Amino acid sequence: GSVDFAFELRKAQDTGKIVMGARKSIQYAKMGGAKLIIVARNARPDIKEDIEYYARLSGIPVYEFEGTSVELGTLLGRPHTVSALAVVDPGESRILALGGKE
């Protein structure tokens, strides 16, 4: 329902904690220390399938971002292309409403 997403990411990184990176998102999904993991649809197939498969069995919901790694990186505040990010603490932001189970 016209989910902004931008305000939720900046509020989650300022109040809570956000772990940006393709390889770091797999390590957090392996042990099970993340609330919500967001993956970019324009990222690599092996990166998206490894994070989704490892997050499914551990018990962490995944949200497919409606855009690209360039827009996700520019939106978070980093000049590099972000393929995947692991949200450990939501805090004040309503990031769990975008794809945190229904």
Curated annotation (Swiss-Prot):
GO terms for biological process: translation. Pfam families: Ribosomal_L7Ae. One of its GO terms (cellular component) is cytosolic large ribosomal subunit. It comes from the Archaea. GO terms for molecular function: RNA binding; structural constituent of ribosome. Keywords: Ribonucleoprotein, Ribosomal protein. InterPro entries: Ribosomal_eL30, Ribosomal_eL30-like, Ribosomal_eL30-like_sf, Ribosomal_eL30_CS, Ribosomal_eL8/eL30/eS12/Gad45. NCBIfam families: PRK01018.1 (NF002172). Belongs to the eukaryotic ribosomal protein eL30 family. This is Large ribosomal subunit protein eL30. It comes from Thermococcus celer. The gene is rpl30e.
